[PDB]
Amino acid sequence: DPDPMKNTCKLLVVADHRFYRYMGRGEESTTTNYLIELIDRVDDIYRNTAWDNAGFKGYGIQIEQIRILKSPQEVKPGEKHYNMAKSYPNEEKDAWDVKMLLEQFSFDIAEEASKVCLAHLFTYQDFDMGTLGLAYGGHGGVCPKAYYSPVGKKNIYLNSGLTSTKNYGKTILTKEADLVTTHELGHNFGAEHDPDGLAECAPNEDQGGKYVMYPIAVSGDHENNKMFSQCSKQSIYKTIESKAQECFQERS
Numbered sequence: 001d002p003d004p005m006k007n008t009c010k011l012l013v014v015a016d017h018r019f020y021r022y023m024g025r026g027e028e029s030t031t032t033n034y035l036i037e038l039i040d041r042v043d044d045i046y047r048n049t050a051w052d053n054a055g056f057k058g059y060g061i062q063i064e065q066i067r068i069l070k071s072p073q074e075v076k077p078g079e080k081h082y083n084m085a086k087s088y089p090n091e092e093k094d095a096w097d098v099k100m101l102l103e104q105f106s107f108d109i110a111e112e113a114s115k116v117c118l119a120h121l122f123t124y125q126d127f128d129m130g131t132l133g134l135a136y137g138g139h140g141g142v143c144p145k146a147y148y149s150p151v152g153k154k155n156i157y158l159n160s161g162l163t164s165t166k167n168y169g170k171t172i173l174t175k176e177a178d179l180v181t182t183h184e185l186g187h188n189f190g191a192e193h194d195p196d197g198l199a200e201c202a203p204n205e206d207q208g209g210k211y212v213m214y215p216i217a218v219s220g221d222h223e224n225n226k227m228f229s230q231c232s233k234q235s236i237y238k239t240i241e242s243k244a245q246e247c248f249q250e251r252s
């Protein structure tokens with residue numbers, strides 16, 4: 001039975017210096033309005049989903065805090081930070097290696113991440129070969145789970161993910177950005193990618209197209225695009241059932 005007191009995953013939303021400059025036009029109001037409206041549209045998808053195809057619905061997400069990093073993080077030589085001016089490992093590239101960026105963000109935000117259901121980084125960098133985001137889970141996801149980093153020499157938490165709103169040299173459509181964050185939060189909620197081998201979970205274009213957990217970002221105009229497949233629902237249903245009592249809160 002859904003507990004109305006434990007149905008919301010509260011988020012720490014972080015906008016880095018790239019997002020602030022290129023999406024927020026160097027303004028706090030523009031930056032926060034974009035993120036507030038995006039999370040609210042993503043929340044409508046989650047909240048209206050019946051994970052068991054019956055009454056197990058009303059689970060969603062809400063912003064607890066928006067951290068706005070206005071300028072790059074100054075670093076000492078050899079030191080790295082997710083908000084530093086240069087990309088890593090190749091400073092000549094517009095973007096970081098996406099996996100290394102998610103690991104770095106998780107390391108730098110560890111203290112704050114331990115106090116929230118999820119932390120999500122919003123950036124503006126053109127990841128190699130069309131990548132839009134990355135997230136733990138679907139080994140992480142909703143509710144902070146510690147991982148001792150031998151390189152980092154401390155515990156980091158795997159309740160993180162990231163979204164970039166830049167792809168192939170331009171700002172993606174808001175309809176596309178909504179799907180990126182929905183997909184990444186889907187991994188956090190426990191969903192894996194929809195496989196081609198299960199037609200019910202990866203339909204043809206005339207059968208409504210692909211669902212949100214498909215590995216390929218494929219347009220945004222098809223019926224199924226903004227919905228979770230039955231494969232995703234089964235995985236997320238099992239996650240919510242064991243994780244809601246652990247870190248979910250009452251909807252504000």
Ligand SMILES: CC(C)C[C@H](CC(=O)NO)C(=O)N[C@H](C(=O)N[C@@H](C)C(=O)NCCN)C(C)(C)C
Nearest residue numbers: 129130131132133134179180183214215216217
């Ligand atoms: C929201 C999408 C589904 C996220 C995934 C990555 C992923 O599955 N992260 O959780 C992605 O970036 N997919 C890319 C993608 O489909 N991007 C599109 C927009 C693209 O740029 N087209 C590439 C065509 N050669 C890949 C990595 C497959 C190239």
Ligand SMILES: [Ca+2]
Nearest residue numbers: 126127130167
């Ligand atoms: Ca890209």
Ligand SMILES: [Zn+2]
Nearest residue numbers: 183187193215
């Ligand atoms: Zn994915």
